[PDB]
Design a binder for this molecule. Structure first.
Ligand SMILES: O=C(Nc1ccc(Cl)cc1)c1ccccc1NCc1ccncc1
Ligand SMILES: [Cl-]
Length: 288
């Protein structure tokens, strides 16, 4: 019944994750929010390995209050009781010394997000097999998250990061996403409207079945080679009523009838009747 994040106020295992702040050299920025940032760092000894590694580190900005501290502490807890999984950004350790700055350390994804990457081809030539691979990996990563009672709530290509070997990883910049600027978030709070299921928009209801909707838009994002959803549409009270009225996007340019079919399934009015992430993995498995 209880989503993972609200359930994560009821056990941190420093025994396992605590990592000395002296072992980090903090470096260039990767993302600034209002009260949070992510920076690149080099860690010596992460995971009990006396080697040297590049990691990404999320941490509070000045101006941040105890609220954001609690938020980042909830993110850490979540990342600790997850796994991890090839297609999710993996936790590597944390700094939590009382008195010291909170820092969440995860694996570094060298090639940025997937939207930008596909746009960079919209250095090798991209193929249909590639697009399907990425779609399948994200679906695999979401089947993992779902099965952990974890609702993402902002799934979209800007939140899929590209690692080595063509592996893609689900992340969330969270407090470190700049959202004042990004036109992907509209004042309603500012929300990723274009990626949200109708029931989330209207009743403020979120669930794995609403992540599936967003996964649908994500697929549109991928098979348009990093295009933005509902292109040429503005975002007002009217954009909704339509959306709640069977109104959907047309197939993107590099998609297949078969793959379009899949987005439409994800965009069913009734959430109870959108596919589970398990069937998405199988369908696409079948196309690989
Ligand atoms: O994505 C992050 N956390 C997150 C939160 C929720 C979920 Cl489902 C998956 C991951 C995150 C956690 C700590 C530090 C950086 C982070 N993300 C952005 C980053 C940028 C570069 N390479 C890896 C991640
Ligand atoms: Cl560690």
């Amino acid at each position: 019944e209880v989503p993972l994040d609200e359930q994560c106020e009821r056990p941190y295992d420093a025994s396992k994750w605590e990592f000395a702040r002296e072992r980090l050299k903090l470096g260039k920025s990767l993302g600034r929010g209002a009260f949070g940032k992510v920076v690149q760092a080099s860690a010596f000894g992460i995971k009990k390995s006396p080697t040297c590694r590049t990691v990404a580190v999320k941490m509070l900005k000045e101006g941040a209050t105890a609220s954001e501290y609690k938020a980042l502490m909830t993110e850490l807890k979540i990342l600790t009781h997850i796994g991890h999984h090839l297609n999710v950004v993996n936790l590597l350790g944390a700094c939590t010394k009382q008195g010291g700055p909170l820092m969440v350390i995860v694996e570094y994804c060298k090639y940025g997000n997937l939207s930008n990457y596909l746009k960079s081809k919209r250095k090798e030539p991209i193929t249909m097999e590639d697009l399907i691979s990425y779609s399948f990996q994200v679906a695999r990563g979401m089947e993992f998250l779902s099965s952990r009672k974890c609702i993402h709530r902002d799934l979209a290509a800007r939140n899929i990061l590209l690692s080595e070997n063509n592996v893609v990883k689900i992340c969330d910049f969270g407090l470190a996403r700049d959202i004042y600027k990004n036109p992907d978030y509209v004042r309603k709070t500012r929300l990723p409207l274009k990626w949200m299921a109708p029931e989330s928009i209207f009743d403020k209801i979120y669930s794995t079945k609403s992540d599936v909707w967003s996964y649908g838009v994500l697929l549109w994002e991928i098979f348009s080679l990093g295009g933005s959803p509902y292109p040429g549409v503005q975002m007002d009270e009217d954009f909704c009523s339509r959306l709640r009225e069977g109104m959907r996007m047309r197939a993107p340019e590099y998609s297949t009838p078969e793959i379009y079919q899949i987005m439409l399934d994800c965009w069913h009015r009734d959430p109870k009747e959108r596919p589970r992430f398990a069937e998405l993995v199988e369908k696409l498995g079948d196309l690989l």
